[PDB]
Ligand binder design. Structure first.
Ligand code: WP0
Length: 134
């Protein structure tokens, strides 16, 4: 058993709070924000040894990242930012820091009841995205 166990599986977006303002703060343009706003992505999380893979699959875009905890990696985000990402475990929370152009955003993923809750913070702006098992 590992702390990442509770995350593994296929998840589907069930609700989104303040996501348009989060995207604004990150610098996402109008057209991408409207398309993002409709999307109900799936998130597929798997583990093979030390390597964690998170796939995001939506009508617009399929993204995938594979990473080792604490090891920086290159990531192209859904909105096409080219960022330097580091994902660590803080207790049972996966903490994902993306850095680009002197800016930084933090995405936290945690299990709460039967949900996987994703808290996205950019400067003062927080968004919450709630996933359920698909
Ligand atoms: C920022 C941004 N710009 O476009 C996006 C973005 C997504 N964002 C997410 O899915 C959120 C946002 C940050 C981490 C993951 C979280 C998730 O629900 O898995 S999904 C999606 C887009 C752009 C258009 C295509 C579909 N994000």
């Amino acid at each position: 058993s590992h702390m990442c166990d509770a995350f593994v599986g296929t998840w589907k977006l069930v609700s989104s709070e303040n996501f348009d303002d989060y995207m604004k703060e990150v610098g996402v343009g109008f057209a991408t924000r409207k398309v993002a706003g409709m999307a109900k992505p799936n998130m597929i999380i798997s583990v093979n040894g030390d390597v964690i893979t998170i796939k995001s699959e939506s009508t617009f875009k399929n993204t995938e990242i594979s990473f080792i905890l604490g090891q920086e990696f290159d990531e192209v985000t859904a909105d096409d930012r080219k960022v330097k990402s580091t994902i660590t475990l803080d207790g049972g929370v996966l903490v994902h820091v993306q850095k680009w152009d002197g800016k930084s955003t933090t995405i936290k993923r945690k299990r709460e009841d039967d949900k996987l809750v994703v808290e996205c913070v950019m400067k003062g702006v927080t968004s919450t995205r709630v996933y359920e098992r698909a």
